[PDB]
Write a protein that binds this ligand. Structure first.
Ligand SMILES: Cc1nc(N(C)C(=O)Cc2ccc(-c3ccccn3)cc2)sc1S(N)(=O)=O
Ligand SMILES: [Zn+2]
Ligand SMILES: [Zn+2]
Lengths: 415, 48, 50, 150
C-alpha cells in the first residue's frame, strides 16, 4: 500500500545503496534502548524532583545499549547499521524536525547542557504559538523530544565531547494545522531560531563556551536531500561505526503521565518527515498553511541598496545592453549569431598571442552552455573535422602522450 | 541669529527606530512574515 | 589592559567606486568569497606576453 | 450563478449592488475547484475530443500495438494529458489501450485553466452589460488553490 518510505544507505568502504520499504521490523532496531516499567515507576517514586528524575533516567539509559554488531557487505544486512531518509516534495509535512550543531572551544559539563536544554524548550513554544494563532498551545504541557549523539568521536556519567555537539529536536505541528512546501519550512525554522536567540537565560547559560551563535541549519529541506535517523551510527573514514543518536529525557514541568512520555520516545512515527497525524476521532476541518512569503533579505540589505542607488547612480542589466546591440538572450540562436560574428576577433587575438596553437581553431561552432541574469557562457565545439579532435591546453605544455583535453568557452557580461 | 540644530532628531526618528522593533520576537513575527492559509471541510479533508 | 587602550580608524578617503570598495572590505576583514567578486575581477586580465 | 445574480438585481440598490454581485461570482468558482478534487483519478472524465481538421499531438508508438481496437476510429479522437516527470505534459489517446489503464497523475491545472477562461468570458460580459461597469472579471487561480494539484 503506497505511499512508502525510501531510504539511502551508505556502504563500506565506498558506494551507495537504495531501499524502498513497505514495512519493517522496528522492535529489533530499538530493542536495546528501552527501560522497563517497574524501573521507571520505582525511580519516580524515589525522587519527587523533575530535574533529578530526568538526569537519573538518562544515566540509567546511557549504560544499557552496549554496541551494534557490524553488518554484512550485502546491502540487505547493512541497512540495520546505517540509514537516512529522503525528503519528498509531493507530500505534506506533519512534524517539525531541527538539527542542532554546536561548535565549542572549552569543554562543558552535562548539568550545564541539561539546564541549557530546559531553557531552550521555552522560547520555541512561544514562537510556535505566535506562528499558529488558531490553536491552543499550553507552554507547560506540550511535548518536545531530544536526541543526543554518543561520546567517542549521585553524578551522571562523564561527558567528554572533543570539539562539537550534535542534537536533534522533534515536535509535532499543533492541530488542526498542516504545512506544505519547502520554503515554508525554511521560514518556520528561521523564525524559531530568531525567537530562541532573543531569550536571555539561554544566552547567559550557554554563551560562554560556544564560539558563534549560528545553531540551526536551514539547508536540509530540498527535493532529494537526506537526513539521518535516530538510533543509527554514522560511518567513519576508518571504518568503525560511531555516534549513535540516543534519547535525552527533559520532562515537562507539568507532565501528568511520566511513563507515557518516556515510552513515546521509541515510536517510529515521531521522527519522520511525512508520517500520518495522530488524531483522536476525526478531522472536521483542516487548515493548510501553504506559503509564508518569498525570500528574507534583511532590512540592512534593502536600506543599504537603496542608499547606494541614490548616491552612486543607476546601473543597467545585461538585457538592455544586449538589446542595444540588437541581440536578445532568448531563443538561443539570436545570441549564437552574435557569438559567431564576434569569433573573428577572438581567433585573430589567439593567432597573434599564442602562435603555436593556431591551426586548431580554423572552423568551429557555438553551443549554449549556461545562462543567468547577468552572465552567459557559450561553448566552442570543433564542428566535426579538425584533425586534432581534442583541443590542447593554452597555458602549459603537458606531456607528449598526455594530450589532456581542454574545453573552450566564451563568457559574456555587462562589465 | 543662531537656531536649533536638526541633526539629532532626524537620525533618531528615521533609522534607529527600526532596530528596537527588530530586537523583539513579537515585532519580528509581526513585521518579517506574511502567511497564507486555506480551509478544507467535509470529505475533502479526509481525501487530502 | 589592551581593552581600555585601543582606538580604531575606519573609512577611506579616496575611494570613489562601489565594487572596488566592497572587494577591498571583503579582502581586509576575511569574509567569504562569492561568485560576484570572481566575475568582477575578470576585467583586468591580459596575456603575459602583452 | 446567473439566476442568483439576476434575482438579486431586483433589489433596487446603488452601485454597491455590483460589488455584492462580484462576491457571489467568486464564491461559485471556488466551490467548483474544490469539487474537482474528488475526481482527480478519472481519465475518461478529463478527456477531450479532437476532429481531423485541427492540430493534435503525435501518436506514441505503443498505440500501434493495440490490434483490433483500431478499427473503430472513423472521425473523432479522444485525448488526455498526464505528467510523468517534471514539467512534461505529455498526451495520451485513451481509446487505443486495453482496460484497465495504468497512468501517472493526471494534469488538472491545464484543463481547469482551459475551462476557467470560458467561464470568465460570460461573467465579464454580464457585468459590463447589466451595470455598465468597466472592470473585467479575473480569478486568482495561481495564488489561491494551485497547491492542491502540485
Ligand atoms: C552609500 C554608501 N557610501 C559608503 N562609503 C563612502 C564607503 O564605504 C567609503 C569606504 C569606507 C571604507 C573603505 C575600506 C577600504 C579598505 C579597507 C576597509 N575599508 C572603503 C570605502 S558606504 C555606503 S552604505 N550602502 O553602507 O550606506
Ligand atoms: Zn556528549
Ligand atoms: Zn592544462
Amino acid at each position: 500500500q503506497t505511499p512508502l518510505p525510501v531510504y539511502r544507505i551508505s556502504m563500506v568502504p565506498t558506494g551507495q545503496a537504495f531501499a524502498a520499504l513497505a514495512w519493517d521490523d522496528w522492535a529489533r532496531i530499538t530493542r536495546d534502548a528501552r527501560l522497563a516499567e517497574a524501573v521507571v515507576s520505582a525511580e519516580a517514586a524515589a525522587h519527587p524532583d523533575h530535574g533529578a528524575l530526568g538526569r537519573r533516567l538518562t544515566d540509567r539509559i546511557r549504560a544499557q545499549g552496549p554496541v551494534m554488531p557490524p553488518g554484512g557487505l550485502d546491502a540487505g544486512g547493512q541497512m540495520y547499521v546505517n540509514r537516512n531518509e529522503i525528503f519528498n516534495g509531493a507530500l505534506a509535512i506533519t512534524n517539525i524536525i531541527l538539527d542542532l550543531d554546536i561548535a565549542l572551544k572549552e569543554p562543558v559539563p552535562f548539568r550545564r547542557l541539561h539546564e541549557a536544554l530546559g531553557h531552550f524548550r521555552r522560547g520555541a513554544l512561544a514562537a510556535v504559538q505566535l506562528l499558529f494563532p488558531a490553536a491552543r498551545v499550553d507552554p507547560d504541557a506540550y511535548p518536545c523530544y531530544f536526541f543526543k549523539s554518543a561520546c567517542r568521536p549521585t553524578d551522571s556519567p562523564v561527558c567528554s565531547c572533543t570539539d562539537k555537539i550534535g542534537l536533534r529536536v522533534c515536535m509535532p505541528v499543533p492541530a488542526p494545522y498542516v504545512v506544505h512546501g519547502s520554503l515554508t519550512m525554511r521560514g518556520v525554522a528561521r523564525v524559531i531560531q530568531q525567537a530562541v536567540l532573543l531569550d536571555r537565560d539561554f544566552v547567559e547559560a550557554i554563551g560562554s563556551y560556544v564560539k558563534n551563535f549560528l545553531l540551526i541549519d536551514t539547508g536540509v529541506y530540498a527535493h532529494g536531500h537526506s537526513l539521518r535517523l535516530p538510533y543509527f551510527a554514522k560511518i567513519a573514514p576508518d571504518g568503525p561505526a560511531c555516534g549513535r543518536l540516543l534519547p535525552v529525557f527533559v520532562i515537562p514541568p507539568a507532565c501528568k503521565d511520566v511513563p507515557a512520555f518516556v515510552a513515546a520516545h521509541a515510536d517510529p512515527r515521531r521522527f519522520h518527515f511525512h508520517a500520518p497525524p495522530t488524531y483522536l476521532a476525526s478531522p472536521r476541518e483542516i487548515r493548510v498553511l501553504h506559503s509564508l512569503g518569498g525570500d528574507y533579505v534583511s532590512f540592512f540589505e534593502r536600506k543599504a541598496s537603496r542608499n547606494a542607488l541614490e548616491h552612486f547612480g543607476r546601473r543597467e542589466t545585461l538585457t538592455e545592453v544586449l538589446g542595444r546591440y540588437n541581440v536578445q538572450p532568448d531563443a538561443g540562436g539570436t545570441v549564437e549569431g552574435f557569438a559567431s560574428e564576434l569569433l573573428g576577433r577572438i581567433v585573430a587575438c589567439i593567432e597573434t598571442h599564442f602562435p603555436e596553437h593556431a591551426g586548431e581553431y580554423q572552423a568551429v561552432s557555438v553551443r549554449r552552455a549556461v545562462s543567468k541574469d547577468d552572465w552567459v557562457l557559450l561553448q566552442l565545439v570543433p564542428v566535426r573535422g579538425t584533425l586534432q579532435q581534442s583541443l590542447s591546453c593554452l597555458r602549459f605544455k603537458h606531456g607528449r602522450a598526455s594530450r589532456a583535453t581542454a574545453r573552450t568557452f566564451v563568457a559574456l557580461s555587462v562589465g | 541669529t543662531e537656531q536649533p540644530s536638526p541633526l539629532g532628531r532626524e537620525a533618531v526618528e528615521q533609522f534607529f527606530c527600526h532596530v528596537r522593533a527588530q530586537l523583539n520576537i513579537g515585532e519580528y513575527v509581526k513585521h518579517n512574515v506574511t502567511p497564507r492559509e486555506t480551509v478544507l471541510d467535509g470529505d475533502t479533508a479526509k481525501a487530502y | 589592559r589592551l581593552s581600555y587602550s585601543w582606538a580604531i580608524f575606519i573609512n577611506n578617503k579616496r575611494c570613489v567606486e562601489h565594487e572596488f570598495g566592497n572587494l577591498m572590505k571583503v579582502l581586509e576583514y576575511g569574509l567569504p568569497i562569492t561568485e560576484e567578486h570572481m566575475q568582477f575581477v575578470d576585467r583586468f586580465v591580459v596575456p603575459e606576453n602583452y | 450563478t446567473l439566476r442568483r445574480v439576476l434575482g438579486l438585481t431586483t433589489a433596487c440598490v446603488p452601485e454597491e449592488d455590483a460589488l455584492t454581485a462580484r462576491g457571489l461570482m467568486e464564491d461559485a468558482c471556488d466551490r467548483l475547484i474544490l469539487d474537482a478534487f474528488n475526481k482527480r483519478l478519472d481519465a475518461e472524465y478529463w478527456s477531450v475530443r479532437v476532429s481531423p481538421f485541427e492540430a493534435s499531438d503525435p501518436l506514441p508508438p505503443t498505440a500501434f500495438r493495440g490490434g483490433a481496437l483500431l478499427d473503430a476510429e472513423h472521425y473523432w479522437r479522444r485525448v488526455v494529458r498526464v505528467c510523468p516527470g517534471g514539467g512534461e505534459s505529455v498526451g495520451v489517446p485513451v481509446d487505443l489501450y486495453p482496460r484497465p489503464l495504468v497512468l501517472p497523475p493526471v494534469d488538472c491545472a491545464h484543463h481547469l485553466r482551459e475551462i476557467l477562461r470560458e467561464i470568465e468570458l460570460v461573467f465579464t460580459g454580464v457585468l459590463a452589460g447589466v451595470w455598465g461597469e468597466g472592470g473585467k472579471f479575473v480569478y486568482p487561480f495561481d495564488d489561491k488553490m494551485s497547491f492542491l494539484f502540485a
